[model samples]
Target: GAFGGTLTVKTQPTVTYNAVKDSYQFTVTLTGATASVTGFLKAGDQVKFTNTYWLQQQTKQALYNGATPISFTATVTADANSDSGGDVTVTLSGVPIYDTTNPQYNSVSRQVEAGDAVSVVGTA
Candidate 1:
């Protein structure tokens, strides 16, 4: 079963548009002496690579260094092949804003893999 609702429009001259390009970073701690890793951001219409995690590798996302970088976090996890203490990956995808009338939530198409970073940025 499913449900539906009607649309209600309110008259208000309050609209804000901000152009913001944030930065993301992460420091992957190593636990093993050997492992190959690949990381990338998968935002809407944008895909960026960070680094290749090799055996005992420490990668950093300093691409946006020396600036008013937006606050971003990283996801550090173990990769396949049973390697412990894998590195981290930062991203900015599908961050929702407060919407009273039509509040929408972000959707995850699939799981975060070794190469899947920022999957979405804004809305669809």
Candidate 2:
């Protein structure tokens, strides 16, 4: 009999405000389907993700035009089994600033807005 396997992956992004650090805490949650495949992902195996991108929301035209794209790689610590699938969490610190025009109020007024999404293309 042939081994038929299926994998389903889903990701969620969340942002939180930090008063002390004056930055935003971004977190991404990845959930995968269960049913381990032969020679594929198994428990205790490390999963590496690449081409991760996050979007920054801007209110003004200048700020929106001046915004830069950021990319980073995140790794899942370990894999766990579940009836449906497994889940992993990755946290990142985001500090948005505008220094093109003026240096003042750049870091102080920086903030992370809602509707930000994190997307990953490839996995290893």
Candidate 3:
């Protein structure tokens, strides 16, 4: 157990929440582990997005015991794509996205793909 938990990104959805107009939310799906994994992310984990589309915030959370599908939320400031209100589309390819999980190398950059767009949002 070397504290190696590969957080795989399944899908990421970027959208505008009219509940609080002018605000956006970037969410991603992460798998805890496949088999015998160690060091899963818990609450308060700082998730950061390097690219900003006039964006203001990022970083969301979760817990685990086995193969858990974790929902991550990044509070974005502005809308990158204007889809009017449902299903915002944006690509996070080649963008270095990761977590501050002590040593900080436990995240992936090319694992986040938005709805069919190629992106990297995974862990190592």
Candidate 4:
């Protein structure tokens, strides 16, 4: 297995109500989902991430867009080789859509990087 591991959603994304503020808060109490893996990508897999966890084995969130009221979209990033623009990539749920949230987004060819990271996006 190239990049395979058992992942658990220790904390799934959920919403809570705040009567004092009269608003619905999109929130998630997250802890690192007990996991890790080693591969070719693992050989030099240095590191960088924030509050990251696994939904499926591949699906995840960057988590700081703060699209309040209910829905949200976090800034996505994959940190693999090249610090600026790596040769690898990441794709979310839709079809093959390139990741938009990267330190140096390659507008010429593809999308995001090849490592990983996660953030908590709450609010509007």
Higher-ranked by lDDT: 3 or 4: 3
Model with the higher TM-score, candidate 2 or 3: 2
* Candidate 2, number of clashes: 0
> What is the per-residue lDDT of model 4 for residues 36-79, given as tens digits with 9 covering 90 to 100?
32111222222222322222223223444432222223322233
Kindly give the stretch of ten consecutive residues in candidate 1 with the minimal lDDT sum.
Answer: 4-13
* Pairs of residues clashing in candidate 3: 56-77, 108-122, 109-120, 110-120, 111-120, 111-121, 112-119, 112-120, 112-121
lDDT of 2 by residue, 24-96 (tens): 5445454444544223333233333332222324334243453353333332323333333444344444423
Q: Which stretches of candidate 3 lie over 4 Å from their true place?
A: 1-3, 17-22, 35-39, 48-124
- Backbone atom clashes (below 3 Å) for every candidate: 4, 0, 9, 10
Candidate 1 lDDT over residue span 19-90, tens digit each: 343422222221221234333212332322222112111112234333321222223222212122332322
Rank candidates by TM-score, best first: 2, 3, 1, 4
User: In terms of lDDT, which candidate is strongest?
Assistant: 2
Model 2 bad stretches (over 4 Å): 1-27, 37-70, 80-124
The full ranking of all candidates by lDDT, starting with the best, is 2, 3, 4, 1
How do the residues 2-107 of candidate 3 rate in per-residue lDDT, one tens digit apiece?
3332233345544333333434345544333233322233223333333322111222233322332223433322222322222222222112223221223454
**TM-score winner:** 2
What is the lDDT, from 0 to 100, of the residue 2 in candidate 4? Answer: 21
